[PDB]
Design a protein around this ligand. Sequence first.
Ligand SMILES: [Ca+2]
Ligand SMILES: [Ca+2]
Length: 448
Amino acid sequence: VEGAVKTEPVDLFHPGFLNSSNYRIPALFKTKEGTLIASIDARRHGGADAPNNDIDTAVRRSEDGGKTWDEGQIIMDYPDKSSVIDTTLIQDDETGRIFLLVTHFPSKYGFWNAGLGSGFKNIDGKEYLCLYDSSGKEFTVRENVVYDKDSNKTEYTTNALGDLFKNGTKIDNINSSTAPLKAKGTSYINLVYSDDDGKTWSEPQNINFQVKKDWMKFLGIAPGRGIQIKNGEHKGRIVVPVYYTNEKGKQSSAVIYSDDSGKNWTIGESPNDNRKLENGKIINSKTLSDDAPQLTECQVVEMPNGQLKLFMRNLSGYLNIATSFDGGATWDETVEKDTNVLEPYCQLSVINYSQKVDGKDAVIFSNPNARSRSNGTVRIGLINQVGTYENGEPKYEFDWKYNKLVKPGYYAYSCLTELSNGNIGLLYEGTPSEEMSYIEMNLKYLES
Ligand SMILES: [Ca+2]
Ligand SMILES: [Ca+2]
């Protein structure tokens, strides 16, 4: 239609960019200053997941609304097949700080073989990263100084990137396959930040000691974006979707969040905690022993009153949606199955939209609308209150009134953003692990 915009795809990441053969896992975010930040996994040895790769985090920026992009940079790169995978972007609008979080594994580890727990030990009221020698003896890192099990200082120190120094000389890195002292082989959540609109980034902080429980095996970022709550009693809270496995390997979604501008973090309950399944069975994420109720990668949006909605990858074939009345600390016992939205067991993107559509608050959604990773479709969901819960809170559901096919054929992970002009940017996996495509769309197109 006249005035509709759907730009021809640009390969924002592609084989050879930053000398990486492969790319996967898009994240896309517009900063308060109007800059677009795109992050991605630079998968250097193919498209495979950790541990069968060496994966770094790459970032590109656009200062002109996505028309042109910079030359890129690598912002986290560990040695020897230690990988960072699955990025997410969020900003604290009060401080202008941008956050990027990612999952990190030492060499040889990934989802399936992750060890239990955080990899930290409490010594006299502070958590310290553990290191292990060849015989399995346990050491702790205390303000970057390595102590043995009898609390004697050793000759070793570390840095934030895991380099291992003997008397001040680098000898290895605690994430490698050869270091004489190694971190526990498990997942870790890393956090970096930028105070200059994404041009430069801090070195990673390992926040596992705050967010990973002793009974979790894997805990990872659910890739895409987070939110900062705009309304109500938890205004300002930074919310970052995650998912984890228990000791039996079964997956449940949650969010981690910060009320102090990213300094400290907490993990909330999963929607699988005290979940009431369809016919009344009650489950918990710690004890879940069946595949069918699993909840995995997810993205979160906010309702007009501040209520949160967690949209989740799951095994039902359809979108699942959880509701939180308390800023992501806990979820209502009922997970909605929205049979109007196919979910082929793939990551999805959902965002709030800043203007009403047809008189209603709205969200924008992207996923493969099929029983396979194909038929990539962007939707506009209109929020409607459909009643109240027994506790008197509003109950909201979505009217998926506008649904537009944007990518025939292959379509896997994706990430949306609203642009400064009110249009929609989208970065998507239109190939398995090679070209990652960016387009801009307007609502005239999406509603046509
Ligand atoms: Ca690397
Ligand atoms: Ca619950």
